[PDB]
């Protein structure tokens, strides 16, 4: 029986829902058995990637002097980073626009 | 009466409040971040499943998820996600 309980996220030191991650792993037909540390490790990785993207987007929003991160700032944050762009090379971001880029031969002089 | 839908909105928001206390977010950027989280979840999950199949294992372990991360994440993203996950797993084991 249950009692005054906790979260597995709190035990792992994570903000992401390790329990939900374990549920999705077990109901996703990824394998018959799902080890207990797998959703913890995966939630840690998911939180790390989300934190990196959100921090870069917040820096980009600050440089724009905006308070709230928007798809434009997410696009800027992702495209302006070599390996994050590599990871999201195939991905399209709605309302993200494109990086400002004009080829040198198109400029005057 | 009406049905419920799960998302990662609250956890993305808490991570946002941790990394940038004053910086907010928008509905559309939260949708994009939900999609990003789901996409990478699916990517590592699928790759770990294939690792288990290739190695004839019934179980997805933290070692399988680690190898999937090392395969899918380029460069220093791999190193830092491995460090984050290893720290989380060691903490969970100790607690």
């Amino acid at each position, epitope marked *: 029986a249950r009692a005054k309980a906790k979260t597995r996220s709190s035990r792992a030191g994570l903000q992401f829902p390790v329990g939900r991650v374990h549920r999705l792993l077990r109901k996703g037909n990824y394998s018959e058995r799902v080890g207990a540390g797998a959703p913890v490790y995966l939630a840690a990785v998911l939180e790390y990637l989300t934190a*990196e993207i959100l921090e*870069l987007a917040g820096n980009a929003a600050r440089d724009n002097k905006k308070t709230r991160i928007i798809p434009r700032h997410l696009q800027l944050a992702i495209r302006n980073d*070599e*390996e994050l762009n590599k990871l999201l090379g195939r991905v399209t971001i709605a309302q993200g626009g494109v990086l400002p880029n004009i080829q040198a031969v198109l400029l005057p002089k | 009466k009406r049905s419920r839908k799960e998302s990662y909105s609250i956890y993305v928001y808490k991570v946002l409040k941790q990394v940038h206390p004053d910086t907010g977010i928008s509905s559309k950027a939260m949708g994009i971040m939900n999609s990003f989280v789901n996409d990478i979840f699916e990517r590592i999950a699928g790759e770990a499943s294939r690792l288990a199949h290739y190695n004839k294992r019934s179980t997805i372990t933290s070692r399988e998820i680690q190898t999937a991360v090392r395969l899918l994440l380029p*460069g*220093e993203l791999a190193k*830092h996600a491995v460090s984050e996950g290893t720290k989380a797993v060691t903490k969970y084991t100790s607690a």
Partner: single-chain antibody
Framework: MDIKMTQSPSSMHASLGERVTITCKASQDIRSYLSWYQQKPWKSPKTLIYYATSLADGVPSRFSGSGSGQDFSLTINNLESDDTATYYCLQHGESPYTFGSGTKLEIKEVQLQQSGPELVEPGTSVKMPCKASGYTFTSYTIQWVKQTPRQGLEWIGYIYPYNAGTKYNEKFKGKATLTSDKSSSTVYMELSSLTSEDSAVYYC?????????????WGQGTSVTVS
């Protein structure tokens, strides 16, 4: 408004096999983006701790870092003769990076090829190359650091070769200029209007675009002397 780095124990003396502890105070919250560097005399600084806790590659467990927010600490457990060096902290949580004042200790393959010493006259301009090898050039920023024997280490700026983005220290706008050549895997920093104040040893330093990644590999240093 620059983040002041405050190493409390400016100098310590210790014997072999005992413990030494160094502390660091910030002026604002930096959220654990702090690194520790060991610089032997006339040698390039080698990183020891990054993200305020993580051991760097090839660093033994004898070094331990701690702290977050504004109070940080470095610990060395089993001192050896080789440990005699000066240790700097470095915060990179805010755009102008700041090194610590330096703590002296006395005990009783990624390659960044850098140019040799250059003697130059005031008012001229100077361009120093960094030749990078052993790693994917475009994925990492190159960080340029100025070490005076009086003001300690100072951060000039970085260039990000993937899109040629740059950021400069407010003290160094105009003075320094950064350019990159992908084909030769070489980055140039140009100094304009040389002054006797500019007489310092400059280090190129590789740093990943990952926020928690620190200046990890350092060039041998190019001394610039202004008459």
């Amino acid at each position: 408004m620059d983040i002041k780095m405050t190493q409390s124990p400016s100098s310590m003396h210790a014997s072999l096999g005992e413990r030494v502890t160094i502390t660091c105070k910030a002026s604002q919250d930096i959220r654990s983006y702090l690194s520790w560097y060991q610089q032997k005399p006339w040698k390039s600084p080698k990183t020891l701790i990054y993200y305020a806790t993580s051991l760097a590659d090839g660093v033994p467990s004898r070094f331990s870092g701690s702290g977050s927010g504004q109070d940080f600490s470095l610990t060395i457990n089993n001192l050896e003769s080789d440990d005699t060096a000066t240790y700097y902290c470095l915060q990179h949580g805010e755009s102008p990076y700041t090194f610590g004042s330096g703590t002296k200790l006395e005990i009783k393959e990624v390659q960044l090829q850098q140019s040799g010493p250059e003697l130059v006259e005031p008012g001229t301009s100077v361009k120093m190359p960094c030749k990078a090898s052993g790693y994917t050039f475009t994925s990492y920023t190159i960080q340029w650091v100025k070490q005076t024997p009086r003001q300690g280490l100072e951060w000039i700026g970085y260039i990000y070769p993937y899109n040629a983005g740059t950021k400069y220290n407010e003290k160094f706008k105009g003075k320094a200029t950064l350019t990159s050549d992908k084909s030769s895997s070489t980055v140039y920093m140009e100094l304009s209007s040389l002054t006797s104040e500019d007489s310092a040893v400059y280090y190129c330093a590789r740093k990943s675009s990952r926020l928690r990644s620190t200046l990890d590999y350092w060039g041998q240093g190019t001394s610039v002397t202004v008459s």
